[PDB]
Each structure stands twice: as structure tokens, then as C-alpha cells.
Design a protein around this ligand. Structure first.
Ligand code: D48
Length: 222
């Protein structure tokens, strides 16, 4: 398949990304608590449902939530302010809460079943969100970094296999703050550092110019 792009909702961020986040890729956004990573995830879950003329892929979404941070009412707001029907937008987001890191790993295998079911339809899965990808692994493997890296590596390999095999954009979030971080090392296809700036602006930079955007009723925008 050709590489598809999903607009983030922000012209500035899209330019930094070359048009949007890519299918057949894992995009990792990392930054401190409150930097806006989950807002970007919510926005992408709407944007992907637009037609290509508007920066989407007419796609369905799968969302693995590890922190109980998915907000359907926020999806509704973004959809209503992106000219979509909120009920339809929510009906094309498959949502699961990961209870721990092992269940999170099983959910990726389960996601493949729904991906296959939708593959030849008019609304194939085009976006798989894992938010937060690292939070369970971090809390469960304190003092056991070597084992944590083994399990994370297999998890990321599973996510790569889905992105490439089924032409999906995988979007993952990673909280990194004071003294913290191996990030995801070199595993993602693309690392985006997100931070707060003056006056509530958010600033994004590719790791390995900068885009500037705001969080609004449209999700994010310039
Ligand atoms: O109904 C489902 C929703 C999911 C969401 C995320 C990952 C896997 C899922 C599997 C389902 O059957």
C-alpha cells in the first residue's frame, strides 16, 4: 500500500510531519504530564474519519486506554467542530481499557481480529492508539529494567507488525518527565517531543523547526 497520512488538525504540526502521521508507521509522542499528548490522540481519532480531501482516510479507530483518559464527550466536541456527526464518529472508535501490561499485550492481538474484519470494508481500521503505552510497564517493572525492556520490545514489535501488515497508523503516547526516560529508545518510526509553551501554546519537535498549536474545541489547531 502507499503511505497514507492523517492530519493532526494543525497546519503547523502537519508541516513538521510532512502532511500528518503516517500509516505503516508508529508515531511516538512523549512529554511531561499535561503537555497535550492525549488531546492529540483524541483529535487524530476524529481527523482520520474525514475524507482525504480534508486530511483523513475515511478510517475506523481502535483505542487502547491504560489510564482511563479517553473521553467520549471530548470526541463529540471535536467531531461537532470538525463538521462530522459525533454519533458516527464514536461508532467508528473501538475502545478497550488495558488492566495491566499483560492484558495490554493481549489487546493488541485482539485488535488484529477486528482489523481483519474491517479490512475490505469502506471503513477499514486506519488508526490504532495506545495511550499510555508505557505506564503499566513502568509501574509493574520497578527495579526490573531488563525484564521491562524485553516485554516492551515484543509489544512494540507486535505494533509494528500491525502498522505495516494492515496499513495502519499506530499512535502511542509516553509520559517522560524529571529524570525519566529511555523514551522508547529507537523503536518508534518517529519520535515527537511535545511541551507546553507560554500562554498555553503547545510546541512539537522531531527527535532524531518546531510546530506550535493550541488546544481548542476543534481538538488542536494553529
Ligand atoms: O471490541 C474491541 C475493541 C478493542 C479496542 C482496542 C483493542 C482491541 C479491541 C478488541 C475488541 O474486540
Amino acid at each position: 500500500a502507499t503511505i497514507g497520512r492523517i492530519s493532526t488538525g494543525s497546519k503547523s504540526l502537519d508541516k513538521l510531519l510532512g502532511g500528518g502521521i503516517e500509516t505503516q508507521a508508529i508515531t511516538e509522542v512523549f512529554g511531561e504530564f499535561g503537555s497535550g499528548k492525549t488531546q492529540l490522540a483524541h483529535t487524530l481519532a476524529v481527523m482520520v474519519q474525514l475524507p482525504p480531501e480534508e486530511g483523513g482516510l475515511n478510517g475506523s479507530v481502535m483505542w487502547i486506554d491504560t489510564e482511563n483518559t479517553f473521553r467520549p464527550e471530548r470526541i463529540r466536541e471535536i467531531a461537532q467542530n470538525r463538521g462530522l456527526d459525533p454519533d458516527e464518529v464514536l461508532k467508528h472508535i473501538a475502545y478497550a481499557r488495558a488492566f495491566n501490561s499483560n492484558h495490554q499485550m493481549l489487546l493488541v492481538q485482539q485488535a488484529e481480529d477486528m482489523i481483519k474484519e474491517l479490512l475490505n470494508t469502506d471503513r477499514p481500521v486506519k488508526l490504532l492508539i495506545v495511550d499510555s503505552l508505557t505506564s503499566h510497564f513502568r509501574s509493574e517493572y520497578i527495579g526490573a529494567l531488563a525484564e521491562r525492556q524485553q516485554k516492551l520490545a515484543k509489544h512494540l514489535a507486535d505494533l509494528h507488525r500491525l502498522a505495516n501488515l494492515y496499513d495502519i497508523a499506530v499512535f502511542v503516547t509516553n509520559q517522560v518527565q524529571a529524570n525519566g526516560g529511555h523514551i522508547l529508545a529507537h523503536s518508534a518510526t518517529l519520535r515527537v517531543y511535545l511541551r507546553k509553551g507560554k500562554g498555553g501554546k503547545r510546541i512539537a519537535r522531531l527527535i532524531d523547526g518546531e510546530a506550535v498549536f493550541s488546544i481548542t474545541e476543534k481538538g488542536i489547531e494553529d
